[PDB]
Design a protein around this ligand. Structure first.
Ligand SMILES: CCCCCCCCCCCCCCCCCC(=O)OC[C@H](COP(=O)([O-])OCC(O)COP(=O)([O-])OC[C@@H](COC(=O)CCCCCCCCCCCCCCCCC)OC(=O)CCCCCCCCCCCCCCCCC)OC(=O)CCCCCCCCCCCCCCCCC
Ligand SMILES: CCCCCCCCCCCCCCCCCC(=O)OC[C@H](COP(=O)(O)OCCN)OC(=O)CCCCCCCCCCCCCCCCC
Ligand SMILES: CCCCCCCCCCCCCCCCCC(=O)OC[C@H](COP(=O)(O)OCCN)OC(=O)CCCCCCCCCCCCCCCCC
Lengths: 83, 104, 344, 96, 171, 90, 171, 308, 98
């Protein structure tokens, strides 16, 4: 602990730039696992409608899919607003 | 290939974006998607010697939709006859071809 | 050269052909070829002498032009069919350009003039690789498209290669140029049998490799890059003659030895296909390879040449060079005819 | 602050794309009718342009498929004006 | 070979909207809730049956049910809509971010004089189920029938008859 | 047409000025620098499409690949450094 | 403007001809630069914004730059090359005229074949989504990071190992 | 109308360069405890015209061992690029609205090495070639960071367009974030423009060519500072007040262009070796690190920007 | 498309002709090789954009990377040749004929 901490202080004095580079590298590779707001990125980029939602036939057995944009049977991204 | 280690491990490094009928990023369709799909689906399972002869109508359709030599030739014949007629004074273009109409 | 550099360069040398053989995309095949070239040049030029630099330059230029032509073939096929793989509908000119490029990559005649010069300017462990490991990717690309090739140009290339290899080895006094021309000849045999049966191309490939590796190792034992230098082998290391002679006869293709079987079965298939005239020409012109291998067997194992004095101190010194692979491969290459039905 | 701003930007983008969605059908129908009328005009002209030629079927497809094949802009604006052709090809790549 | 088939000019002839982009965009979010069924039916026809020449009977209904919307809008509550789309057309990307209060005017006016609520975020960008009497098309690609695959050999394996039969090699 | 007009105008103006002007009266270090610049400019080429790649769904994959790129580039830099390739002391 | 892409391709042809003829390693660099400028212009004509600007910023700004750099620092201009330069300029003129006659004969032999001079301005764009977003070239060149990561690792490895290769070659 | 717009764009930037010369001289004088030009015209506003007349009236002693082609197309190229860079700039609306505009800037900036190198290879010597090689290496090296900085900062606005940064900074400058990327960008503008302390190439041309080189230099200076203002110091944009946006942009660009001269008067020069060490050992590590940081930030934050 | 592709192929052929015909330099061959590279890049990008196949755009990028690497090693070899002989000439590489 002592030897390595003295090494790190020697660095912090001599080449702070290398220390900062490596520490930013570590932060980059580490924070995306700590953060809770990560998943929401994929969620959003999925929620973006760059295409037409081609509908499907009402063949009777499909109760969990709506017949109109204003029905609550389908997905609803109010979490985006609440974000 | 020569060493089907890909198919052995059941993975895909290079064999999912080979041709036009494959998956494009935002579902964007390629030009000859249907023709190529039909050619492949019809040549699947009889590979090679057979598909070069008994799956040839679909290959001809794909070739035409991709290279369009026949369409080029058709339009060129039409335009040549039309130029000859205009030169000799036996036909006049209509307004929408001349550059004026009521558009939509 | 440090361990990290060595590891990176040799991992690339190994990865090139592996990508070529494991990829379905011609672009990735081309990538593998480029890897091979990039990672081979430094090893050629390691010594940093004029001859090595010249060899590296020649190799680079030739292989780069060839790769460009291959990529042109790929691009043309792509514009023609939308797919990145050759099918039964590609304009034969595309495939013949591809074959020319692959032949220049391999060293076939009349695209061979660079191989002896380069091998000469290059050391031994590098000729070994250049002539064994650098023939596997360009041959794989051909094995994948053997049903749709031009037997005419293939046979012309093969027979030209046989002839020029014989008529070069007859004259060269340098081990490395002799090996180059032998490579040319065997690759000609391979190409000849390719469009009819590629399993036999692969057979002859493995036979030639098993026969070449231990020969280059024998040479590297004393760095005897010349006939008058390898003749002193009877005083330097005479326990290697009993095997050099047999391996050279096998290369020549003498009946009772492994090296025969390739020619024999290839001639058989060509006869089944009515290529008897070509098979006859090739079988008659391989005897010159056998000739200038016998001329070496003489100077090495059947007659003692004028030796030197300091060879006495060379005798005083011990040695630990020839690892087990020498014996293993030489035996497998000289005494494995009784097992031909399995190798087939 | 940049996070909280770009999220609202995302919501606005979704709004605009939803407007696009709601509109598209109208546009697709209009476009279909337009291109069909274009091809019909070209055919009605070719009919008399190429009457006296030998062995010329008027409206002869180059396919054995029997299904719909979207036409090329060359096919459409080939008999129309060169400025129309240039607006079709080099019209969006030329900065409005 | 094969004479292409097209429709006449008398048909595919309909009263277009002749209305502009800013207008359609200011009226979209309400035009996506109202007049949605006859739009989904058409965007199902045009995708099941890949030919447009088989959905004119639906495109005409689209145009009609859009004119009815833009006519309700004129009858009731024209001025807020006019000012809203005039403010929209000022920008270049025709953005909703600048015209937010005129939009509230339009929305309150339409909600009082009619029963239209504005679709919330994401409501138009879903995949709804639509119903119709029209049947599903068999062979939409006109998929010429497939060939028959090579008849597969089958039978319990047994060793080779007399070995490899390579020259004079007994086994 | 507009870009063409502007660039043509600029070229004309430059040539006009330069006409009026007349009418009124071996070390391997630089090579290694160029090579390093090549090997970083190609990395820029492989790195530029991030504004389009970060719009995708495979975020766990873009993260990975971009980190791989940057890390191995930094390692190559460090090796060129240790081997005295950034010194200039002939 | 129907002759636009044809003129561009012809200028590319002339540049590669002035390469084939070898004036000197510096005028050759200028010819390469011109040919690359024209190549980018034609890629943009075909719609390749990203591809063309990348050509600009990497091929010219990165490759031809070091070409001229290595040329100046490791090449000497010898006086003989000037007369031969004029000679090969005349050679270039002759080649241009031969190519013109070649194109004439090919048009005479294949009207709708090799080159449809009648259909020059046409057959540039075959199809395009008119109402479509997300169809540029960056959307494809950025696939590498989600699909086709194999290509990205390949290229990164080539560049990585190039460092070691060059340090070992120069040393 | 478009030609009129082109005139309105070109004439003022040339005037602004011609007077930036005078501003430099006066500022350096007052920092050196002197006045600067006062005589030729009121406060000196005629000195640039006087100098232009003088130069263009001199007699060109064109080196005999040279090549007229590379002698004429080098400054032509320099000025052409220095002028065509100003085209896409949103001030706030651009003359040419491009997507990939910053990429066009990168490329049309990297294309000057050709002139700065052909001039040397034309001048038949070895000292001039040495200087040209060194300057080319410097410019090249700093282009790397000039590119990566933007590559990492264009992830707070998911587009290579310059008309998106306005709305990206509609609420806060891009300086508070990326102030470590600016400090590295503000400098690569000096070294790229061979501006002190990075003037190891001007510390061999006739009147007209020297004048064109001068024009190109100062135009590029103003433009680099304008890019800084637009990117890291996003000014005010009220949809109805392009006048306001332009006023603020001008003010900030003048601040920056005066800072350049502040520096020229304040600091010594560098040594080519130390100048290259600077980049390759302080700016590239930090640049790559912050690049990874800014690739991760929009992910572990849900603030990934849009593609319009 | 047909015309521009014909001209691009003619240009590739001309550059290959230049490679196969040396004129006492080596830079004048590396430049022909790079011209070939450029022509292939352009043809590939043009076919991609014509077919609207966005699943094939990485290919120009890859070939550009690898052509760059090839050019780098070629330039290094040329540099060594100059460092040793004094000229990027091809009559000086007359060794290995023995
Ligand atoms: C100084 C150094 C020199 C060293 C090398 C010396 C040369 C080696 C020996 C001679 C050459 C090789 C002989 C071929 C072996 C056959 C293997 C095979 O693949 O085919 C068998 C297989 C079946 O053989 P088969 O004739 O039907 O026999 C059926 C059984 O007899 C019927 O009963 P079964 O089938 O149920 O078998 C029961 C089994 C039960 O036995 C056991 O398990 C007991 C095992 C104890 C073994 C110990 C005794 C070793 C005796 C050999 C002594 C060698 C000296 C070195 C050892 C020192 C010992 C102190 O029998 C065996 O184990 C057989 C042992 C095999 C080795 C001995 C040969 C006997 C086999 C009969 C063939 C005789 C050779 C004729 C070949 C014809 C050539 C045209 O295929 C064949 O039909 C024969 C084809 C072989 C043709 C070869 C063509 C090339 C010939 C040219 C000569 C080149 C040789 C290489 C020399 C190169 C010089 C540079
Ligand atoms: C059965 C079916 C038949 C199928 C066809 C068979 C094909 C024919 C078989 C050919 C086998 C031999 C062919 C190669 C000939 C080798 C020539 C040779 O080795 O003799 C020369 C050399 C003499 O050396 P020298 O300096 O003169 O004095 C003796 C010191 N050793 O000798 C040497 O120096 C050798 C090295 C000395 C090592 C110490 C001695 C140990 C024994 C080594 C030799 C082993 C030979 C085995 C012979 C088996 C024959 C089948
Ligand atoms: C003798 C002295 C010699 C010195 C000469 C030096 C001149 C160099 C001048 C700088 C070079 C500028 C490079 C221009 C590249 C243009 C890149 C670009 O972004 O244009 C693309 C443009 C818009 O496309 P995009 O932004 O992707 O999206 C638009 C959709 N709304 O879409 C387009 O494609 C627009 C059409 C392309 C216009 C480009 C024309 C550039 C100027 C031509 C210069 C000609 C000079 C003479 C010939 C050069 C040598 C052969």
């Amino acid at each position: 602990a002592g030897r390595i901490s003295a090494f790190l202080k020697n660095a912090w004095a001599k080449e702070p730039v290398l220390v900062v580079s490596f520490s930013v590298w570590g932060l980059a590779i580490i924070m995306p696992m700590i953060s809770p707001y990560t998943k929401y990125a994929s969620m959003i980029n999925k929620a973006t409608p760059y295409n037409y939602p081609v509908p499907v036939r009402d063949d009777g057995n499909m109760p969990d899919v709506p017949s109109h944009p204003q029905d609550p049977l389908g997905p609803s991204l109010d979490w985006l607003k609440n974000l | 290939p020569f060493l089907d280690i890909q198919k052995k491990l059941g993975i895909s490094l290079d064999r999912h974006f080979m041709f036009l009928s494959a998956e494009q990023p935002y579902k964007n369709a390629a030009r000859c998607h249907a023709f190529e799909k039909e050619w492949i689906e019809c040549a699947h399972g009889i590979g090679g010697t057979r598909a070069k002869k008994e799956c040839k109508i679909e290959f001809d359709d794909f070739e035409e939709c991709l290279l369009r030599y026949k369409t080029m030739r058709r339009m060129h014949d039409i335009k040549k006859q039309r130029e000859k007629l205009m030169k000799e004074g036996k036909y006049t273009p209509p307004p929408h071809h001349s550059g004026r109409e009521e558009p939509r | 050269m440090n361990p990290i550099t060595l590891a990176i360069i040799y991992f690339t040398i190994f990865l090139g052909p592996v990508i070529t053989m494991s990829s379905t995309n011609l672009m990735l095949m081309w990538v593998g070829l480029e890897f091979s070239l990039l990672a081979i040049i430094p090893m050629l030029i390691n010594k940093k002498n004029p001859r090595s630099t010249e060899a590296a330059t020649k190799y680079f230029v030739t292989q780069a032009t060839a790769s460009m032509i291959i990529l042109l073939a790929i691009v043309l096929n792509y514009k023609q069919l939308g797919t990145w793989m050759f099918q039964q509908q590609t304009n034969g000119l595309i495939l013949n350009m591809t074959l020319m490029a692959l032949s220049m990559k391999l060293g076939l005649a009349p695209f061979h003039f660079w191989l002896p010069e380069v091998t000469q300017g290059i050391p031994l462990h590098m000729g070994l690789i250049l002539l064994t490991w650098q023939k596997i990717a360009p041959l794989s690309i051909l094995i994948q498209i053997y049903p749709l090739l031009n037997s005419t140009i293939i046979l012309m290339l093969a027979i030209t290669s046989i002839f020029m290899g014989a008529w070069g080895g007859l004259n060269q006094t340098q081990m490395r140029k002799i090996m180059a021309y032998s490579s040319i000849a065997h690759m000609g045999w391979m190409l000849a049998i390719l469009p009819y049966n590629p399993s036999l191309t692969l057979l002859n490939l493995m036979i030639y490799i098993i026969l070449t590796a231990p020969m280059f190792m024998a040479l590297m034992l004393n760095n005897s890059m010349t006939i008058n230098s390898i003749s002193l082998l009877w005083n330097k290391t005479p326990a290697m003659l009993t095997m050099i002679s047999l391996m050279l006869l096998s290369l020549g293709g003498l009946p009772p030895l492994t090296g025969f079987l390739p020619k024999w079965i290839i001639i058989t298939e060509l006869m089944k296909n009515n290529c008897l005239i070509m098979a006859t020409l090739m079988a008659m012109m391989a005897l010159l390879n056998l000739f200038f291998y016998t001329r070496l067997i003489y100077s090495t194992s059947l007659t003692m040449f004028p030796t030197n004095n300091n060879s006495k101190m060379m005798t005083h010194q011990t040695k630990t060079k020839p690892n087990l692979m020498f014996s293993t491969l030489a035996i497998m290459s000289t005494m494995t005819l009784p097992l031909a039905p399995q190798l087939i | 602050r940049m996070m909280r701003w770009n999220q609202e930007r995302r919501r606005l983008l979704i709004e605009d794309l939803e407007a696009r969605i709601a509109l598209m059908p109208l546009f697709q129908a209009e476009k279909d009718r337009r291109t069909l009328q274009i091809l019909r005009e070209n055919l009605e002209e070719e009919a008399i342009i190429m009457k006296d030629v030998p062995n010329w079927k008027v409206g002869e497809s180059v396919f054995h498929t029997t299904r719909w094949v979207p036409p090329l802009i060359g096919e459409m604006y080939g008999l129309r004006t060169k400025e129309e052709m240039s607006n079709a090809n080099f019209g969006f790549t030329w900065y409005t | 070979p094969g004479i292409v088939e097209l429709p006449t000019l008398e048909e595919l002839k309909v009263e277009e909207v002749k209305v502009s982009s800013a207008v359609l965009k200011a009226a979209a979010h309400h035009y996506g809730a109202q007049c949605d069924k006859t739009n989904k039916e058409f965007m199902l026809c045009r995708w099941e049956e890949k030919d447009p020449r088989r959905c004119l009977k639906e495109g005409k209904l689209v145009n009609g049910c859009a004119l009815n919307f833009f006519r309700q809008i004129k009858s009731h509550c024209a001025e807020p809509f006019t000012e809203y789309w005039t403010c929209l057309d000022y920008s270049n990307m025709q953005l909703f971010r600048h015209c937010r209060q005129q939009q509230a005017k339009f929305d309150q006016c339409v909600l009082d004089k009619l029963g239209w609520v504005r679709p919330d975020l994401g409501q138009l960008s879903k995949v709804t189920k639509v119903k119709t009497d029209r049947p599903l098309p068999e062979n939409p690609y006109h998929s010429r029938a497939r060939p028959e695959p090579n008849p597969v050999i089958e039978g319990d394996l047994k060793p080779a008859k007399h070995g490899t039969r390579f020259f004079f090699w007994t086994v | 047409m507009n870009l063409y007009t502007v660039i043509f105008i600029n070229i004309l103006l430059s040539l006009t000025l330069i006409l009026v002007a007349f009418w009124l009266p071996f070390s391997m270090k630089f090579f290694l620098v160029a090579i390093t610049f090549l090997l970083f400019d190609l990395e820029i080429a492989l790195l530029l499409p991030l504004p389009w790649a970060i719009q995708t769904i495979k975020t766990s994959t873009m993260m990975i690949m971009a980190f791989i790129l940057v890390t191995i580039l930094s390692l190559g830099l460090a090796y060129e450094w240790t081997q005295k390739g950034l010194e200039w002391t002939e | 403007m129907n002759n636009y892409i044809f003129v561009l391709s012809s200028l590319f042809l002339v540049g590669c001809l002035g390469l084939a003829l070898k004036p000197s390693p510096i005028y050759g660099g200028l010819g390469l630069i011109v040919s690359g400028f024209v190549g980018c212009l034609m890629v943009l004509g075909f719609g390749g914004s990203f591809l063309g600007l990348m050509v600009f910023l990497i091929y010219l700004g990165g490759m031809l730059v070091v070409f001229g750099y290595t040329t100046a620092m490791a090449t000497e201009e010898y006086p003989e090359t000037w007369g031969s330069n004029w000679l090969i300029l005349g050679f270039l003129v002759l080649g241009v005229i031969m190519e013109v006659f070649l194109i004439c004969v090919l048009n005479y032999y294949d009207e709708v074949g090799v080159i449809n001079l009648d259909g020059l301005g046409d057959w540039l764009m075959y199809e395009v989504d008119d109402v479509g977003v997300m169809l540029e070239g960056g959307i494809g060149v950025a696939a590498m990071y989600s699909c086709a990561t194999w290509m990205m690792v390949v290229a990164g490895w080539s560049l990585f190992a190039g460092i070691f290769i060059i340090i070992e070659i120069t040393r | 109308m478009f030609f009129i717009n082109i005139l309105t764009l070109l004439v003022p930037i040339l005037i602004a360069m011609a007077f930036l010369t005078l501003v430099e001289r006066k500022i350096l004088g007052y920092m050196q405890l002197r006045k600067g030009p006062n005589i030729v015209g009121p406060y000196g506003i005629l000195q640039p015209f006087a100098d232009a007349m003088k130069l263009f009236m001199k007699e060109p002693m064109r080196p005999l061992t040279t090549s007229m082609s590379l002698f004429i197309i080098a400054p032509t190229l320099s000025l052409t690029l220095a002028l065509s860079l100003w085209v896409p700039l949103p001030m706030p609306h651009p003359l040419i609205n491009l997507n990939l505009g910053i990429l066009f800037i990168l490329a049309t900036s990297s294309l000057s090495v050709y002139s700065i190198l052909w001039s040397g290879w034309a001048s038949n010597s070895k000292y001039s070639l040495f200087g040209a090689l060194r300057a080319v290496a410097q410019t090249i090296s700093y282009e790397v960071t000039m590119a990566i900085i933007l590559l990492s900062v264009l992830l707070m606005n998911g587009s290579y367009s310059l008309q998106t940064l306005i709305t990206t900074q509609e609420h806060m400058w891009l300086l508070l974030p990326a102030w470590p990327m600016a400090m590295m960008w503000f400098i690569s503008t000096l070294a790229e423009t061979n501006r002190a302390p990075f003037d190891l190439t001007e510390g061999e041309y006739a009147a007209g060519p020297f004048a064109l080189f001068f024009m190109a230099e100062y135009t590029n200076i103003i433009l680099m500072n304008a890019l800084t203002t637009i990117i890291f110091l996003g000014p005010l944009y009220y949809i109805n007040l392009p006048e306001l946006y332009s006023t603020n942009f001008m003010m900030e660009a003048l601040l920056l262009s005066s800072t350049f001269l502040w520096i020229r008067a304040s600091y010594p020069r560098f040594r080519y070796d130390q100048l290259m060490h600077l980049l390759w050992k302080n700016f590239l590590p930090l640049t790559l690190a912050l690049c990874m940081w800014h690739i991760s930030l929009p992910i572990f934050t849900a603030g990934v920007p849009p593609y319009m | 498309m047909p015309s521009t592709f014909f001209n691009l192929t003619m240009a590739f052929s001309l550059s290959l002709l230049g490679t196969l015909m040396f004129r006492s330099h080596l830079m004048s061959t590396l430049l022909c090789l790079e011209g070939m590279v450029l022509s292939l890049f352009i043809m590939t990008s043009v076919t991609s954009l014509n077919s609207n196949s966005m699943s094939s755009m990485p290919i120009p990028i890859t070939i550009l990377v690898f052509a760059a690497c090839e050019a780098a090693v070629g330039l290094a070899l040329l540099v060594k040749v100059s460092n040793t002989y004094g000229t990027d000439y091809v009559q000086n590489l007359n060794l290995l004929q023995c």
